[PDB]
Design a protein around this motif. Structure first.
Motif, PDB file in Angstrom:
ATOM      1  N   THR F   1       0.640  -1.388   0.078  1.00 49.62           N
ATOM      2  CA  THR F   1      -0.310  -0.061   0.099  1.00 49.62           C
ATOM      3  C   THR F   1       1.033   0.871   0.464  1.00 49.62           C
ATOM      4  OG1 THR F   1      -1.454  -1.109   1.321  1.00 49.62           O
ATOM      5  CG2 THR F   1      -1.771   1.094   1.253  1.00 49.62           C
ATOM      6  N   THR F   2       0.682   1.637  -1.323  1.00 46.89           N
ATOM      7  CA  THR F   2       1.511   3.554  -1.160  1.00 46.89           C
ATOM      8  C   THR F   2       0.877   4.562  -1.134  1.00 46.89           C
ATOM      9  OG1 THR F   2       3.698   1.993  -2.931  1.00 46.89           O
ATOM     10  CG2 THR F   2       3.679   4.249  -2.527  1.00 46.89           C
ATOM     11  N   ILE F   3       0.624   4.856   0.399  1.00 45.99           N
ATOM     12  CA  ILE F   3      -0.125   6.280  -0.012  1.00 45.99           C
ATOM     13  C   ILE F   3       0.743   7.261   0.467  1.00 45.99           C
ATOM     14  CG2 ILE F   3      -2.026   5.120   0.869  1.00 45.99           C
ATOM     15  CD1 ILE F   3      -1.580   5.916   3.530  1.00 45.99           C
ATOM     16  N   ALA F   4       0.227   8.682  -0.762  1.00 47.87           N
ATOM     17  CA  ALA F   4       1.359   9.532  -0.700  1.00 47.87           C
ATOM     18  C   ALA F   4       0.806  10.994  -0.172  1.00 47.87           C
ATOM     19  CB  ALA F   4       2.798   9.214  -1.031  1.00 47.87           C
ATOM     20  N   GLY F   5       1.142  12.010   0.332  1.00 50.41           N
ATOM     21  CA  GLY F   5       0.867  13.313  -0.009  1.00 50.41           C
ATOM     22  C   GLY F   5       1.935  13.909   0.011  1.00 50.41           C
ATOM     23  N   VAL F   6       1.447  15.593  -1.115  1.00 44.11           N
ATOM     24  CA  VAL F   6       2.470  16.814  -0.935  1.00 44.11           C
ATOM     25  C   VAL F   6       1.411  17.621  -0.750  1.00 44.11           C
ATOM     26  CG1 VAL F   6       2.129  17.777  -3.325  1.00 44.11           C
ATOM     27  CG2 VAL F   6       4.141  16.351  -1.709  1.00 44.11           C
ATOM     28  N   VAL F   7       2.083  18.969  -0.100  1.00 44.31           N
ATOM     29  CA  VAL F   7       1.642  20.479  -0.364  1.00 44.31           C
ATOM     30  C   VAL F   7       2.260  21.313  -1.627  1.00 44.31           C
ATOM     31  CG1 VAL F   7       0.959  20.295   2.143  1.00 44.31           C
ATOM     32  CG2 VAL F   7       3.224  21.451   1.616  1.00 44.31           C
ATOM     33  N   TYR F   8       0.853  21.679  -2.409  1.00 43.49           N
ATOM     34  CA  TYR F   8       1.307  21.960  -3.423  1.00 43.49           C
ATOM     35  C   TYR F   8       1.123  23.885  -2.773  1.00 43.49           C
ATOM     36  CZ  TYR F   8      -3.186  23.104  -5.264  1.00 43.49           C
ATOM     37  OH  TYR F   8      -4.379  23.158  -5.949  1.00 43.49           O
ATOM     38  N   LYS F   9       1.457  25.163  -4.028  1.00 40.15           N
ATOM     39  CA  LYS F   9       0.848  26.012  -3.129  1.00 40.15           C
ATOM     40  C   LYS F   9      -0.069  26.010  -3.073  1.00 40.15           C
ATOM     41  N   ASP F  10      -1.662  26.107  -3.288  1.00 40.83           N
ATOM     42  CA  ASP F  10      -2.603  26.150  -2.546  1.00 40.83           C
ATOM     43  C   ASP F  10      -3.339  24.850  -1.978  1.00 40.83           C
ATOM     44  N   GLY F  11      -2.864  24.348  -1.880  1.00 38.06           N
ATOM     45  CA  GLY F  11      -3.500  22.411  -1.387  1.00 38.06           C
ATOM     46  C   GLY F  11      -3.085  21.710  -1.269  1.00 38.06           C
ATOM     47  N   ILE F  12      -3.688  20.392  -1.477  1.00 37.58           N
ATOM     48  CA  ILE F  12      -2.949  19.418  -1.118  1.00 37.58           C
ATOM     49  C   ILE F  12      -2.753  18.285  -2.401  1.00 37.58           C
ATOM     50  CG2 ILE F  12      -3.941  16.911   0.152  1.00 37.58           C
ATOM     51  CD1 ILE F  12      -2.426  19.848   1.981  1.00 37.58           C
ATOM     52  N   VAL F  13      -1.889  17.389  -2.501  1.00 35.41           N
ATOM     53  CA  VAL F  13      -2.870  16.367  -3.782  1.00 35.41           C
ATOM     54  C   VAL F  13      -2.260  14.741  -2.930  1.00 35.41           C
ATOM     55  CG1 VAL F  13      -2.547  15.320  -5.792  1.00 35.41           C
ATOM     56  CG2 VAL F  13      -1.182  17.775  -5.439  1.00 35.41           C
ATOM     57  N   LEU F  14      -3.202  13.648  -2.695  1.00 40.36           N
ATOM     58  CA  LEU F  14      -3.248  12.518  -2.271  1.00 40.36           C
ATOM     59  C   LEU F  14      -3.116  11.482  -2.923  1.00 40.36           C
ATOM     60  CD1 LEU F  14      -5.718  13.452   0.481  1.00 40.36           C
ATOM     61  CD2 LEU F  14      -3.149  13.085   0.813  1.00 40.36           C
ATOM     62  N   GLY F  15      -1.984  10.522  -2.703  1.00 37.95           N
ATOM     63  CA  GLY F  15      -1.996   9.936  -3.667  1.00 37.95           C
ATOM     64  C   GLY F  15      -2.674   8.353  -2.774  1.00 37.95           C
ATOM     65  N   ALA F  16      -2.696   6.600  -3.923  1.00 37.02           N
ATOM     66  CA  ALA F  16      -2.640   5.826  -3.095  1.00 37.02           C
ATOM     67  C   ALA F  16      -2.663   4.575  -4.512  1.00 37.02           C
ATOM     68  CB  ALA F  16      -3.915   5.848  -2.781  1.00 37.02           C
ATOM     69  N   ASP F  17      -2.148   3.949  -4.440  1.00 35.42           N
ATOM     70  CA  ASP F  17      -2.378   2.575  -5.717  1.00 35.42           C
ATOM     71  C   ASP F  17      -3.366   1.984  -4.977  1.00 35.42           C
ATOM     72  OD1 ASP F  17      -1.658   1.119  -2.423  1.00 35.42           O
ATOM     73  OD2 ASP F  17      -1.974  -0.423  -3.517  1.00 35.42           O
ATOM     74  N   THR F  18      -4.105   0.656  -5.710  1.00 36.30           N
ATOM     75  CA  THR F  18      -5.538   0.803  -5.780  1.00 36.30           C
ATOM     76  C   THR F  18      -5.471  -1.119  -5.667  1.00 36.30           C
ATOM     77  OG1 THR F  18      -5.027   0.936  -8.427  1.00 36.30           O
ATOM     78  CG2 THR F  18      -6.692   1.782  -7.214  1.00 36.30           C
ATOM     79  N   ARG F  19      -4.465  -1.523  -5.315  1.00 35.00           N
ATOM     80  CA  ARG F  19      -4.329  -2.920  -4.698  1.00 35.00           C
ATOM     81  C   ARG F  19      -4.382  -3.457  -3.214  1.00 35.00           C
ATOM     82  NH1 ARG F  19       1.033  -6.485  -6.546  1.00 35.00           N
ATOM     83  NH2 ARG F  19       0.310  -6.252  -8.681  1.00 35.00           N
ATOM     84  N   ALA F  20      -5.036  -4.412  -2.737  1.00 34.59           N
ATOM     85  CA  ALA F  20      -5.523  -4.937  -1.000  1.00 34.59           C
ATOM     86  C   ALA F  20      -5.067  -6.133  -1.390  1.00 34.59           C
ATOM     87  CB  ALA F  20      -6.603  -4.861  -1.253  1.00 34.59           C
ATOM     88  N   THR F  21      -3.494  -6.567  -0.842  1.00 32.79           N
ATOM     89  CA  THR F  21      -3.265  -8.094  -1.345  1.00 32.79           C
ATOM     90  C   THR F  21      -3.536  -8.337   0.395  1.00 32.79           C
ATOM     91  OG1 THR F  21      -1.604  -6.844  -0.162  1.00 32.79           O
ATOM     92  CG2 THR F  21      -1.343  -7.848  -2.480  1.00 32.79           C
ATOM     93  N   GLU F  22      -4.196 -10.037   0.251  1.00 31.91           N
ATOM     94  CA  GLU F  22      -4.831 -10.783   1.522  1.00 31.91           C
ATOM     95  C   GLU F  22      -2.952 -11.751   1.252  1.00 31.91           C
ATOM     96  N   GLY F  23      -2.919 -11.410   1.840  1.00 33.17           N
ATOM     97  CA  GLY F  23      -1.412 -12.751   2.527  1.00 33.17           C
ATOM     98  C   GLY F  23      -0.363 -12.296   1.027  1.00 33.17           C
ATOM     99  N   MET F  24      -0.485 -12.663   0.225  1.00 33.98           N
ATOM    100  CA  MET F  24       1.030 -13.221  -1.142  1.00 33.98           C
ATOM    101  C   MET F  24       0.025 -13.222  -2.340  1.00 33.98           C
ATOM    102  SD  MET F  24       2.840 -12.316   0.675  1.00 33.98           S
ATOM    103  CE  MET F  24       4.147 -11.481  -0.441  1.00 33.98           C
ATOM    104  N   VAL F  25      -1.522 -13.284  -2.258  1.00 39.98           N
ATOM    105  CA  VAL F  25      -2.437 -13.008  -3.287  1.00 39.98           C
ATOM    106  C   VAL F  25      -3.386 -11.387  -3.459  1.00 39.98           C
ATOM    107  CG1 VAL F  25      -3.981 -14.937  -2.341  1.00 39.98           C
ATOM    108  CG2 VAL F  25      -4.419 -14.276  -4.077  1.00 39.98           C
ATOM    109  N   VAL F  26      -3.284 -11.038  -4.892  1.00 38.56           N
ATOM    110  CA  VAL F  26      -3.748  -9.939  -4.949  1.00 38.56           C
ATOM    111  C   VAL F  26      -5.608 -10.314  -4.744  1.00 38.56           C
ATOM    112  CG1 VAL F  26      -4.262  -8.120  -6.484  1.00 38.56           C
ATOM    113  CG2 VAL F  26      -1.731  -8.998  -6.464  1.00 38.56           C
ATOM    114  N   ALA F  27      -6.079  -9.671  -3.547  1.00 43.07           N
ATOM    115  CA  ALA F  27      -7.698 -10.185  -3.877  1.00 43.07           C
ATOM    116  C   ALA F  27      -8.078  -9.716  -4.322  1.00 43.07           C
ATOM    117  CB  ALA F  27      -7.890  -9.672  -1.854  1.00 43.07           C
ATOM    118  N   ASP F  28      -7.289  -8.151  -4.488  1.00 40.72           N
ATOM    119  CA  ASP F  28      -8.573  -7.360  -5.459  1.00 40.72           C
ATOM    120  C   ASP F  28      -8.134  -6.114  -6.498  1.00 40.72           C
ATOM    121  N   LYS F  29      -8.355  -5.958  -7.503  1.00 40.01           N
ATOM    122  CA  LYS F  29      -7.295  -4.537  -8.129  1.00 40.01           C
ATOM    123  C   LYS F  29      -8.844  -3.433  -8.219  1.00 40.01           C
ATOM    124  CE  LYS F  29      -7.198  -7.823 -10.856  1.00 40.01           C
ATOM    125  NZ  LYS F  29      -6.761  -8.992 -12.004  1.00 40.01           N
TER     126      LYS F  29
END
Lengths: 239, 213, 204, 239, 202, 222, 215, 80, 240
Positions: F1-29
């Protein structure tokens, strides 16, 4: 009758008489308090009567600071007034702890007022007989004046009064707001003093009045020193 | 990590008699290899006709003595009589069981005169089992002291020897001797012996000196 | 694992205007099958079904508990639950025991009460909701089933095709897992009707 | 009328008097008299017990709280039994916790606190037993009386109960002699003072007198029916 | 973390490193561990960030309510005692070491140290945190009584720098604050400004 | 799960990946990890997924009652404190690590809340398994006073770095841009990787699967 | 305190004729680091009683606060009664035992020293709550090192004079500095006499390092 | 009769409790004190909910052979 | 009229009579006076001797609420002893948590709030005791605070409570107390106590005097008997 005598019982005409009786108590104190809101300042003035020379003048005050930037004047039974001030101070801090920003004045009146409704609906306790007027500066909406009465009503007013001469005081203030000229800090203080003085016919000396002010430039509530009060009083007489 | 108990050592002995009861104890409190004090008698006088002897964790002994003392007063106020030795024994049994789950590490012996005027010794396990016993040794040297009392007082394993009721004098001599033997071979016991003789006149306390280590 | 003790497999798939939910039928304690007729798919509505796989006790309790909540909801609101709402209600039930979790992984499959749009979703032990447009699988054989499903599933499948894909996937998958199997039941839900068929499978 | 204001301990009367507490105080008068006096070395309690019938035994008026403290009850016996238990437990507690006999004065403060709570709160009736507490502590012999009202007083001597004014009168006149008195003299003075309370026909007998003595060397002892004979024999005849 | 306070006549200089680390990863390289409990009472926080941040906020709430009701500036000793009770009562559950320093008109600049476990000791100079161990010698040798505020600012900076180089957990910019009757002056020292001591260079 | 955020001059940009993994199998995309706290506050979550969903939801709800009563848009600090205190009481048992981003009257604020109740107000924050990889991109290219488009690129590059470098993360990149004036929830901001074409059709014709029994129950549509 | 944190070692006391003297090092050590070097481990409970502690400074600080209030409360009562050294010892024994029973031990082991009614009292209370009264008491490694020196003087002469007693404690403190790592040179000595409790400020021990050159 | 049944029961349990705790037989006086203590509670003396508010309406004559020999104690609703 | 039966009730004209009725209780009790001078606060109580039997130096109406503060009470004594306990507990708590001797102004407020609570609820009657607290701390100064049964608390340069409150105030008023020193005030307090006592109605009185100030090193303490005796003599001579 017997419709009065318990807060819970409602009159055959639905009037909850005990709550009304409490508003009478504020007047029994015999003191009046006036608050007026200026373009940049909010001022609360109250009459200070010291019954005995022995009493220390410093201890007797009806002006309390709920938080650094909110100030209140409580009229009514003195003991009840102090009790509400503590609850307000607790509520004000609890907001900063839980939400991280100073309580907005409107929300302090709302919380304090809501506490009063619980007393009005539950049988054992008696509605506290005091009315609190809060003055504060909100950055978004500028100066604010709010009054909470023993009923739980919490309206905010451009100017208001509480006490024996409240009706007369309101009329004087109403005439002055209707002829709106806006109010500079000096005028806001002057209007307040003239109103209290005219309604009471007192012609006040610096000792008899306690005046508290909140300004946008200096947001913290300050209780003016006797000299500062005298300066405004002298100006009123001069003009 | 925290261990709630330590073995403070000590040995207690009680010998009943037709008309007398003798309870005796060491006076040394030892934690580990160190000797905390050489003057801590382990015998306490509950009432004129009863003495309690406690060995084990001292902290438990102090609390138990305080509890028994309090309860004795409460029995007196409520029932307007002194607790008998038999009663104290039963009450102690219940008190000890109360903590079956986090126990009192105290081996306790109550010795006293019964209502008939005979001497009775009651011995209790740490969890409160109580048996009326003619002689009992409790504590670090129970193992060393008990066998001798059994041969001498109980005439056990002795053939063609007559049975004579114990006399206060023979018993005092026996108690002094058994404790002298334990001082020599049990590291915990030593310093001094307090012998408390309960007779119709009352508790009398005699102290003799056993070898300082 | 605790999940492997009783064993199970549940799958759901989304076709065009149809949903299919299929599950194995073996109830066994560790290695001994006791019954070949266990119910792991329970009807939660006219066209909404829930599939529970995991400890059998939990499968029975969570279904019984959910029905209590659902029946009252239907009586109180006089409406059938929309599929997304059951997922939320289930997630609340599971999260409530976040500590000491009921060991079941549920799969909810249904058609929206009015639109008839298909809905397939799965939840974890602690109650995390995942809504997927393709297939959702839960159980001991999840790895085996995920692979069979990824390859076989094709978008906008017709009902007859959906049954063939779900059946092939469950049958092949439970074959490669020891603790699930002994028969599979496929329920197909289409707006007009519900068809439940029991497939023929290796009983070993 | 004024029937109102007397119903509960929670209602203050128009003139500042809580009537139920006063009514409770009247209960002590109903009970048989008891006299307590002190000497520099000893404190003595003497009581006049009453009997329901000739066949019935006389009631216990003197009770032992602890070796150093004992009480004599005048008033409802039930309240006394309850208060005595509280006192006994408080004393037992001090010995377990601090291994010191509780200072007698401290115990009386505790009895006062427990006694006051019924007076201010709706619910339990005010305790209606009047208690004379006597003890020897390190400070010295002490005699204290406790009213049904929680107020407690330290006294050189006191008699509580029916016709107790007569005893207080004798005690006041012969008071100076008491401080240097020997134990026999002190009990004798007391037996005479309670005699005053008795009706003229009635006489002190071994059966109706109970004496409790506590002193530096004496643990509180209640000399009873046959053991009051030494103290009683020396006494003279009615004045 | 290395947190150090030194009391100069009329006030205190508090200083701290900026590094907060989860394992060997520096999660935040610019954290502020010097927090304002009140207008002139600040606390340097070392130990678990979670515990320190909670206790700091709870004390800010309590000291503030008390100050408004007493209508007086709060006493630094009072703040310390509040921290001491919380840290002592929950010693088993909390892993926090706090140095409370402030100026109160009654007792002047005061530095109090609450080590883990809940002890309050007033100290002329107090060092705390993992990096403190390395600088115990520098402070003992360097501390001289009656240092001026400027002298203290340098002393705190040099000390914190020496620890920062020898402790992995310590690092980042040095945050330094001087609290006095006049007010709080907060300064951040970065890069060249951080004092540098020469390496062995064999 | 990579979630990341930055403060731009007038606001915030928030980013995240779209994969959920149960153990080592990708449960969902296509899993959504940028939750909504309030119109002005959006929070991305990593750690036990259920905990993140429930905690964000409870705070989203509490903030709605607060905003309705106060009558003013919720402040970011309130969100942080409510979140931190709840997490602290649970002592890390609720393992939710969140990046909370919002614009309030005070301005643009981004906070990172670790599971034990720690919070950091920071210009750039990344959390989750791929956080280390993402942080590298941020440390290398974050510049203060970035314009919004540059910021979206930095956050996209960072989530991308996590998607390729870390096994747990992986799928589409989602960016949410909060500005004083507006909020844009850009789901599928980028689809970095796509499934390859299935060369062989293995579709099963009808009759492939045997059926022992069948029951057709006709639902009554009405 | 399940785990001790900042701790202090060895408080020694001996009963002189007319009073008791207890002495303590002023070091609280964070596990081998002499972190706190001016802490005072001796307290004046009342004019007749003084207590010193070895163990977690924190638990001692709590006990000082609780015990101090208990003394203040008796004084306000103003009944002329006051707590004897024996009483303070009894309370501590019950208190330490209670915490042991709740498995939340107070790590401190303490010496209660007092002179009241012309009799000196010196008592020991351990974390597990073992309590006893004895002529000379040493807590900590002192029990292993200092107590043998103190007992020998006492067995040969049961009664000692104040000057003799202070000298013995200085000598015993010297041994402890020489052979105990947790000890510190600075120590405070406090004596309960009929007059009251007086605590001397940092007193230091002259040390003989002659054996070093012997090697 | 009914309130007597409660008072006879407290007495039966208290005699038995004494055997268990002290392995002896309670004297008639102690047993009366024990039942009396229950009777005194009618005053709302305790905060326990399960105590009758009304004073008990029974008078019991308790007679037994104890250590002091035959004894008869009389108890009244007051609890004396 | 049922308005006066409870404190929960408010009379139609706005007055809570039960509190006023409680205030009348203090007037039943004997007068007690407290005067604050520059050095410290001196309190005096005229303690009527109801009976010769009662021990002297007992039935005290002056209590030490903490090392630095003293309380003089008038009104139902039982309530006062209980209020004193509440005050002592509050003082202990302030020391235990905030770590220093309670500022008196705060103490008065905390005790007052407790007293006020009784005013609101119907289950509990208003307390019937009016009390004065005084303390001297070098930082705070000398402070005298009086609490009515209502819970109103104010600071008084000089104050009187009890049956002769009005008469005493007139005498206290002519004192110029601010300039006066503590030792001189003790004589003055006695003069006032003697003037107010009515010999005909009240048979006899024992003056109990207590003081806190720089002289007492900020510890409230009963005035030493030598000082009290000198003052009682000054008073009788002045009474003439």
């Amino acid at each position: 009758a017997g419709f009065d005598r318990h807060i819970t019982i409602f009159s055959p005409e639905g009037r909850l008489y005990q709550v009304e009786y409490a508003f009478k108590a504020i007047n029994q104190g015999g003191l009046t308090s006036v608050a007026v809101r200026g373009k940049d300042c909010a001022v609360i003035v109250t009459q200070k009567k010291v019954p005995d020379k022995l009493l220390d003048s410093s201890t007797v005050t009806h002006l309390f600071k709920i938080t650094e930037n909110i100030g209140c004047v409580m009229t009514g039974m003195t003991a009840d007034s102090r009790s509400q001030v503590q609850r307000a101070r607790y509520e004000a801090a609890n907001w900063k702890y839980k939400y991280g920003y100073e309580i907005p004045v409107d929300m302090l009146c709302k919380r304090i007022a809501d506490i009063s409704q619980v007393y009005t609906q539950n049988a054992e306790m008696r509605p506290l007989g005091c009315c609190m007027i809060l003055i504060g500066i909100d950055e978004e909406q500028g100066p604010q004046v709010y009054k909470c009465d023993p009923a739980g009503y919490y309206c905010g007013f451009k100017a208001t009064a509480a006490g024996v001469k409240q009706t007369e005081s309101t009329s004087f203030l109403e005439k002055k707001v209707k002829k709106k000229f806006d109010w500079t800090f000096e005028q806001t203080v002057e209007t307040a003093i003239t109103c209290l003085s005219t309604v009471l016919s007192i012609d006040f000396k610096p000792s008899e009045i306690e005046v508290g002010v909140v300004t946008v430039e200096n947001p913290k509530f300050r209780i003016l020193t006797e000299a500062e009060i005298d300066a405004h009083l002298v100006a009123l007489a001069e003009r | 990590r925290f261990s709630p108990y330590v073995f403070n050592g000590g040995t207690i002995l009680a010998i009943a008699g037709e008309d007398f009861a003798i309870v005796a104890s060491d006076t040394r409190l030892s934690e580990g290899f160190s000797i905390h004090t050489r003057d801590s008698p382990k015998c306490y006088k509950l009432t004129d006709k009863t003495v309690i002897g406690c060995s084990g964790f001292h902290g438990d002994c102090l609390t138990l003595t305080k509890i028994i003392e309090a309860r004795l007063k409460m029995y007196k106020h409520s029932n307007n009589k002194a607790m008998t030795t038999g009663a104290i024994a039963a009450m102690l049994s219940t008190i000890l069981y109360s903590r079956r789950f986090f126990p009192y590490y105290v081996y306790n012996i109550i010795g006293g005169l019964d209502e008939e005027g005979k001497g009775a010794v009651y011995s209790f396990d740490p969890v409160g089992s109580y048996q009326r016993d003619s002689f009992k040794a409790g504590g670090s040297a129970s193992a060393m002291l008990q066998p001798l009392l059994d041969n001498q007082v109980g005439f056990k394993n002795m053939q063609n020897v007559e049975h004579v009721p114990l006399s206060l004098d023979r018993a005092m001599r026996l108690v002094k001797d058994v404790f002298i033997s334990a001082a020599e071979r049990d590291v915990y016991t030593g310093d001094a012996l307090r012998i408390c003789i309960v007779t119709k006149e009352g508790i009398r306390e005699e102290t003799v000196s056993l070898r300082k280590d | 694992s605790i999940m492997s003790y009783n064993g199970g497999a549940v799958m759901a798939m989304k076709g065009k205007n149809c949903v299919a939910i299929a599950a194995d039928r073996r109830f066994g304690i560790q290695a001994q099958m006791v019954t070949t007729d266990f119910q792991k798919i329970f009807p939660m509505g006219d066209r909404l079904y829930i599939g529970l796989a995991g400890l059998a006790t939990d499968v029975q309790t969570v279904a019984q508990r959910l029905k209590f909540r659902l029946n009252l909801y239907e009586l109180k609101e006089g409406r059938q639950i929309k599929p997304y709402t059951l997922m939320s209600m289930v997630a609340n039930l599971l999260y409530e025991k976040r500590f000491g979790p009921y060991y079941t992984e549920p799969v909810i499959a249904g058609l929206d009460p009015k639109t008839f749009k298909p809905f397939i979703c799965s939840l974890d032990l602690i109650g995390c909701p995942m809504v997927t447009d393709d297939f959702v699988v839960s159980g001991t054989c999840a790895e085996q089933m995920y692979g069979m499903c990824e390859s076989l599933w094709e978008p906008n499948m017709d009902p007859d095709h959906l049954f063939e894909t779900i059946s092939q996937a469950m049958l092949n998958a439970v074959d490669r897992d020891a603790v699930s199997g002994m028969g599979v039941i496929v329920h197909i839900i289409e707006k007009d009707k519900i068809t439940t068929r029991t497939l023929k499978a290796r009983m070993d | 009328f004024r029937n109102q204001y007397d119903n509960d301990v929670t209602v203050w009367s128009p003139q500042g008097r809580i009537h139920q507490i006063e009514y409770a105080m009247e209960a002590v008068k109903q009970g048989s008299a008891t006299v307590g006096l002190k000497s520099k070395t000893h404190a003595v309690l003497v009581a006049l017990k009453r009997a329901q019938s000739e066949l019935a035994a006389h009631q216990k008026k003197i009770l032992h709280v602890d070796n150093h403290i004992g009480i004599s009850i005048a008033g409802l016996t039930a309240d006394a039994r309850l208060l005595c238990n509280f006192m006994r437990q408080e004393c037992l507690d001090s010995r377990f916790v601090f291994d010191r006999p509780l200072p007698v004065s401290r115990l009386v403060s505790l009895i006062g606190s427990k006694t006051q709570i019924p007076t201010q709160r709706y619910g339990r009736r005010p305790y209606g037993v009047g208690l004379l507490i006597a003890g020897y502590d390190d400070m010295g012999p002490h005699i204290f009386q406790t009213c049904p009202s929680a107020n407690y007083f330290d006294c050189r001597a006191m008699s509580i109960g029916a016709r107790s004014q007569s005893a207080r009168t004798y005690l006041e006149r012969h008071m100076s002699e008491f401080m240097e008195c020997n134990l026999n003299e002190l009990v004798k003075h007391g037996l005479r003072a309670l005699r005053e309370t008795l009706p003229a026909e009635q006489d002190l007998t071994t059966k109706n007198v109970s004496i409790g003595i506590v002193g530096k060397d004496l643990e509180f002892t209640i000399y009873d029916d046959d053991d009051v004979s030494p103290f009683l024999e020396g006494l003279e005849e009615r004045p | 973390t290395t947190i150090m306070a030194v009391q100069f006549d009329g006030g205190v200089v508090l200083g701290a490193d900026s590094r907060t680390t989860t394992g060997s990863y520096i999660a935040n390289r610019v954290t502020d561990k010097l927090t304002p409990i009140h207008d002139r009472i600040f606390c340097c926080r070392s130990g678990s960030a979670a515990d320190t941040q909670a206790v700091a906020d709870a004390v800010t709430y309590q000291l503030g309510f008390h100050s408004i009701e007493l209508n007086e500036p709060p006493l630094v000793h009072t703040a310390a005692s509040l921290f001491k009770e919380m840290c002592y009562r929950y010693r088993e559950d909390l892993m926090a070491g706090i140095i409370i320093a402030g100026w109160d008109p009654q007792e002047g600049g005061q530095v109090y140290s609450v080590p883990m476990g809940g002890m309050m000791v007033r100290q002329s100079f107090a060092i705390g945190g993992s990096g403190s161990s390395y600088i115990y010698g520098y402070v003992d040798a360097t501390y001289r009584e009656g240092m001026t505020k400027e002298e203290c600012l340098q002393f705190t900076a040099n000390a914190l720098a020496l620890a920062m180089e020898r402790d992995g957990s310590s690092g980042g910019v040095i945050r330094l604050a001087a609290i006095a009757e006049s007010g709080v002056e907060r300064q951040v020292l970065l890069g060249d400004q951080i004092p540098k001591f020469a390496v062995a260079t064999l | 799960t990579t979630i990341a955020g930055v403060v731009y001059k007038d606001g915030i940009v928030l980013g995240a990946d779209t994969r959920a993994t149960e153990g080592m199998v990708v449960a969902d995309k296509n899993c959504s990890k940028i939750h909504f706290i309030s119109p002005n506050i959006y929070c991305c979550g990593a750690g036990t997924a259920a905990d993140t969903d429930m905690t964000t939801q409870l705070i989203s709800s509490n903030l709605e009652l607060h905003s309705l009563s106060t009558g003013r848009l919720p402040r970011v600090v309130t969100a942080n404190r409510m979140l931190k205190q709840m997490l602290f009481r649970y002592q890390g048992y609720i393992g939710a690590a969140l990046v909370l981003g919002g614009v309030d009257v005070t301005g643009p604020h981004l906070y990172s809340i670790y599971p034990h109740g720690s919070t950091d107000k920071l210009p750039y924050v990344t959390m989750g398994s791929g956080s280390l990889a993402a942080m590298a991109v941020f440390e290398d290219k974050f510049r203060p006073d970035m314009e919004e488009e540059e910021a979206k690129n930095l956050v996209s590059e960072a989530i991308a770095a996590g998607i390729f470098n870390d096994l747990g993360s992986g799928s589409n990149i989602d960016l949410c841009v909060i500005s004083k004036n507006k909020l844009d929830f850009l789901r599928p901001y980028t689809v970095p990787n796509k499934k390859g074409t299935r060369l062989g059709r293995y579709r099963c014709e009808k009759g492939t699967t045997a059926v022992l029994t069948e029951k057709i129950t006709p639902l009554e549509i009405e | 305190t399940q785990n001790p944190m900042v701790t202090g070692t060895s408080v020694l006391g001996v009963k002189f004729e007319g009073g008791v003297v207890i002495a303590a090092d002023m070091l609280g050590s964070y596990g081998s680091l002499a972190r706190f070097r001016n802490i005072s481990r001796i307290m004046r409970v009342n004019n007749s009683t003084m207590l010193g502690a070895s163990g977690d400074y924190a638990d001692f600080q709590y006990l000082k606060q609780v015990l101090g209030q208990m003394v203040i409360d008796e004084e306000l009562l103003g009944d002329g009664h006051s707590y004897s050294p024996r009483a303070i010892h009894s309370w501590l024994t019950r208190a330490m035992y209670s915490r042991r029973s709740k498995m939340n031990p107070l790590w401190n082991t303490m010496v209660i020293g007092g002179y009241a009614d012309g009799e000196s009292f010196l008592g020991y209370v351990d974390m597990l709550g073992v309590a006893y009264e004895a002529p000379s008491l040493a807590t900590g490694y002192g029990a292993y090192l200092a107590q043998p020196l103190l007992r020998e003087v006492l067995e040969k002469q049961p009664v000692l004079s104040q000057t003799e007693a202070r000298d013995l404690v200085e000598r015993c403190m010297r041994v402890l500095y020489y052979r105990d790592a947790r000890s510190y040179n600075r120590f405070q000595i406090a004596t309960v006499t009929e007059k009251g409790v007086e605590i001397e400020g940092p007193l230091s021990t002259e040390t003989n390092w002659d054996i070093a050159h012997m090697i | 009769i009914a309130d007597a049944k409660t008072l006879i029961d407290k007495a039966r349990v208290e005699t038995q409790n004494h055997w268990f705790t002290y392995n002896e037989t309670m004297t008639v006086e102690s047993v009366t004190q024990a039942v009396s203590n229950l009777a005194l509670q009618f005053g709302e003396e305790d905060a326990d909910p399960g105590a009758m508010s009304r004073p008990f309406g029974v008078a019991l004559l308790f007679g037994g052979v104890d250590e002091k020999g035959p004894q008869l104690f009389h108890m009244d609703p007051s609890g004396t | 009229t049922g308005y006066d039966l409870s404190a929960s009730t408010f009379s139609p004209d706005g007055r809570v009579f039960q509190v006023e009725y409680a205030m009348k209780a203090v007037e039943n009790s004997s007068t007690a006076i407290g005067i604050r001078c520059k050095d410290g606060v001196v309190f005096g109580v005229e303690k009527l001797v109801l009976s010769k039997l009662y021990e002297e130096g007992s039935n005290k109406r002056l209590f030490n609420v903490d090392r630095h503060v003293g309380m003089a009470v008038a009104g139902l004594l039982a309530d006062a002893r209980s209020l004193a306990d509440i005050a002592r507990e509050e003082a202990s708590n302030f020391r235990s948590n905030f770590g220093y001797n309670i500022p008196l102004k705060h103490l008065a407020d905390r005790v007052a709030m407790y007293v006020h609570a009784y005013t609101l609820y119907s289950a509990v009657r208003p307390f019937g005791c009016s009390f004065m607290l005084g303390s001297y701390s070098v930082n705070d100064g000398a402070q005298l605070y009086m609490i009515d049964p209502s819970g109103v608390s104010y600071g008084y340069w000089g104050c009187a409570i009890g049956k002769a409150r009005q008469a005493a105030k007139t005498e206290i008023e002519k004192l110029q107390m601010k300039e006066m020193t503590c030792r001189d005030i003790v004589k003055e307090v006695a003069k006032i106590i003697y003037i107010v006592h009515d010999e005909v109605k009240d048979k006899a009185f024992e003056l109990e005097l207590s003081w806190v100030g720089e002289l007492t090193n900020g510890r409230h303490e009963i005035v030493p008997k030598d000082i009290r005796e000198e003052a009682e003599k000054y008073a009788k001579e002045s009474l003439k």
